Design a protein around this ligand. Structure first.
Ligand SMILES: O=C(O)[C@H](O)Cc1c[nH]c2ccccc12
Ligand SMILES: [Mg+2]
Length: 717
């Protein structure tokens, strides 16, 4: 392209140069030995990678055939389960065990709080996410519909005092609920002082302390007239900023300017479903941002925050981290990428490359940043890698062996590279204990989702019959059981106090009132973390962890088995004649708009995540798993005669101009309508649906990557 020869590999020059000039210096790793390591690891692990992919296909073919030779309407669970066991899909449950993972930071082992996920190719967003460890509660309340924009309290071009007062009152109630006063309410506070290491809150008629003095964590400024007061509840910090001479402070009874919440405790820097990266140039853009993050010098000048200084209650000095602790999500076992090809021209597995390169790069986050002093990331010496889309314990074991070999190449101690196991494929769900066991000395989390897991659910039972609607899926018995089972398995493996048990993303970015009402379900269900789409959502989701004592919840769940294998295996088949014709067309339109809305940005602009208007103009921020579910759902309805290929076409044709219109705010946008078959993005959308049934596990990357490359190539006219 050109390329650099290293043993059997031919490495794109842009990648070779990036590694030598930017990634390797400072790690003390010999460049020649690194490259030899890449060649050797790729040579050794590629056949097993392929074998695992082939095993997926064989298992799916047998399941397809199982359904096709049967006609008995309600599936016979006893026979179905027996079959899955016979073919090696459902494996024996291993004996009880406790994970042994060590060298993990407090943010992961102990603290319960929000976890942000952000596309690594977007430097600005990545920087904001890393800085989202602390976030303004006032900004999050004033800025969103959590304070409804009723008559009088609407957002204007400038400060609305009626709304501001609602913000202040909301936050006073939060303080009363989270760090209660011995007597009275924060609502009536007139001032704060620190006396003999104790926080003293002035009320109109008297003073009072905290009902739990231990929740006083520190302050800034003079004890007798502090600039801020720091509190702690359920392990998360709350900072009341005091400034009577500020916009908001001047209107406040105690001169309070803002309430800052410790928010995004951890952040996942994403190389997978939220980015579009289809070649060496794209991968290098991502690797370079990941590098800047770990070295602490990424600047877009928007830069990375320093740690925060405080005075302890007794008068001593301390610091708290000002940055979100970073994971990186590598791609999974499926895709290859032409950033490296072999002597035959065969592309190298992208997951293997990500392990080597993001692993190398992460070394920088384990050492002092030349910018602001202290090392950026893990003080305990771990590298946290989220590994998506695995199917079963052999695939987890493979990932661990991959990490083991990379560690050897990088000169890292064994088990430095920790694994966040995504539970987003059915064959992992039903063998979860075994998957955790295979990574018992590396695992730092498990997590559940809606989108990918539902995509796998549909594809796996594609031949069984028509599935329920997309919106219906999120409340089906299989998924509710999957959610509980994930928690059960993690807690039984001793995750409490050792590893994160995590839940899925809130995708409706503008519907924050609904988020605050609803997402509380997740920490109530024993999750020590869950996914948020923005720093703003991280600050709001933090509220939930102040209301819910996750550590106590997990202790209470101990020993409980709340999901059976039968519940897990309950296929979401639609009942006979479940929909009217208008409902069918609505669901078709929903899915085509979902696919078109996402695919047009991906293919034409290389954007893998953004705020996308749905069919009802609700802003959704979904990653690529949205494509997997929608295309699989339509493929399934087309497969079983629910809709015809003309229904699909007409819907694509109806939805495309609507998508075009929804993208009017974009200088770079290129309309799909009316020259449909001249738009590579439109053809991509069509191809995802019509070829959906034949994509391995319904994965959208093979078609998406090809189409994006096609667009890129023709752009080079
Ligand atoms: O499985 C699911 O529910 C989704 O894949 C998760 C998800 C939704 N929006 C996102 C934005 C960035 C990163 C991940 C996501
Ligand atoms: Mg996913």
């Amino acid at each position: 392209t050109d390329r650099v020869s290293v043993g059997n590999l031919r490495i794109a020059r842009v990648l070779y140069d990036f590694v030598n000039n930017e990634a390797l210096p400072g790690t003390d790793i010999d460049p020649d030995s690194f490259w030899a390591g890449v060649d050797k690891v790729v040579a050794d692990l590629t056949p097993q990678n392929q074998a695992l992919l082939n095993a997926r296909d064989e298992l799916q073919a047998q399941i397809d055939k199982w359904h096709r030779r049967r006609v008995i309407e309600p599936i016979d669970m006893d026979a179905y389960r027996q079959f899955l066991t016979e073919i090696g899909y459902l494996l024996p449950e291993p004996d009880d065990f406790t994970i042994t993972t060590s060298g993990v930071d407090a943010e992961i082992t102990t603290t319960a709080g929000p976890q942000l996920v952000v596309p690594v190719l977007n430097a600005r967003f990545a920087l904001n996410a890393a800085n989202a460890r602390w976030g303004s509660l006032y900004d999050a309340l004033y800025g969103t519909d959590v304070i409804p924009e009723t008559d009088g309290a609407e957002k204007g071009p400038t400060y609305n005092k009626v709304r501001g007062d609602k913000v202040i009152a909301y936050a006073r109630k939060f303080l009363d609920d989270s760090v209660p006063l011995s007597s009275g309410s924060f609502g009536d506070a007139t001032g704060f002082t620190v006396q003999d290491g104790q926080l003293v809150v002035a009320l109109p008629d008297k003073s009072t302390g905290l009902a739990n003095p231990g929740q006083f964590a520190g302050y800034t400024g003079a004890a007798e007239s502090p600039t801020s007061v720091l509190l702690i509840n359920h392990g998360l910090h709350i900072e009341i900023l005091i400034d009577p001479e500020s916009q908001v402070g001047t209107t406040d009874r105690a001169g309070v300017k803002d309430v800052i919440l410790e928010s995004a405790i951890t952040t996942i820097m994403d190389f997978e479903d939220s980015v579009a990266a289809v070649d060496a140039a794209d991968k290098v853009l991502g690797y370079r941002n990941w590098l800047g993050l770990n070295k602490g010098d990424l600047a877009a000048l928007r830069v990375l925050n320093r740690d925060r200084n405080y005075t302890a209650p007794g008068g001593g000095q301390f610091t708290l981290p000002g940055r979100s602790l970073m994971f990186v999500r590598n791609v999974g076992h499926l895709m290859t990428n032409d950033a490296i090809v072999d002597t035959d021209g065969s592309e190298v597995f992208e997951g293997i490359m990500d392990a080597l390169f993001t692993g190398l790069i992460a070394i920088h986050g384990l050492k002092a940043s030349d910018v602001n002093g202290p090392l950026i990331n893990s003080r305990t010496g771990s590298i946290y890698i989220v590994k998506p889309k695995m199917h079963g314990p052999a695939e987890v074991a493979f990932t661990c062996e991959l990490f083991s070999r990379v560690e050897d190449v990088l000169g890292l101690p064994q088990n430095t590279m920790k694994i966040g196991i995504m539970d987003e494929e059915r064959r992992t769900t039903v063998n979860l204990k075994a998957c955790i066991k295979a990574a018992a000395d590396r695992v730092v989390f498990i997590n559940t989702g809606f989108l990918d897991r539902t995509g796998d659910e549909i594809h796996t039972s594609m031949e069984a019959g028509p599935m329920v609607r997309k919106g219906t899926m999120k409340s089906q018995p299989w998924i509710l059981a999957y959610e509980d089972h994930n928690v059960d398995a993690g807690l039984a493996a001793g995750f409490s106090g050792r590893a994160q048990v995590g839940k899925g993303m809130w995708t409706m970015t503008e519907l924050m009132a609904d988020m605050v009402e609803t997402k509380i379900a997740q920490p109530r269900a024993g999750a020590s973390t869950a996914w948020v789409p923005s720093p703003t959502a991280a600050t709001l989701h933090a509220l939930h962890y102040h209301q819910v004592d996750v550590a106590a919840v997990q202790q209470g769940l101990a020993g409980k088995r709340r999901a059976t294998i039968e519940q897990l295996l309950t296929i979401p088949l639609a009942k006979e004649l479940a929909w009217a014709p208008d409902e069918i067309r609505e669901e078709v339109d929903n899915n085509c708009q979902s696919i078109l809305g996402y695919v047009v940005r991906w293919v034409d602009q290389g954007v893998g995540a953004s705020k996308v208007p749905d069919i009802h103009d609700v802003a959704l921020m979904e990653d690529r798993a949205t494509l997997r579910i929608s295309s699989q759902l339509l493929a399934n309805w087309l497969r079983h005669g629910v809709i015809t290929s003309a229904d699909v076409r007409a819907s694509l044709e109806r939805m495309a101009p609507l998508v075009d219109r929804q993208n009017a705010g974009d200088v770079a946008y290129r309309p799909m309508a009316p020259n449909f078959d001249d738009s590579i993005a439109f053809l991509a959308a069509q191809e995802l649906i019509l070829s959906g049934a034949q994509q391995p596990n319904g994965y959208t990357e093979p078609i998406l990557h090809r189409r994006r490359r096609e667009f890129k190539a023709r752009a080079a006219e």
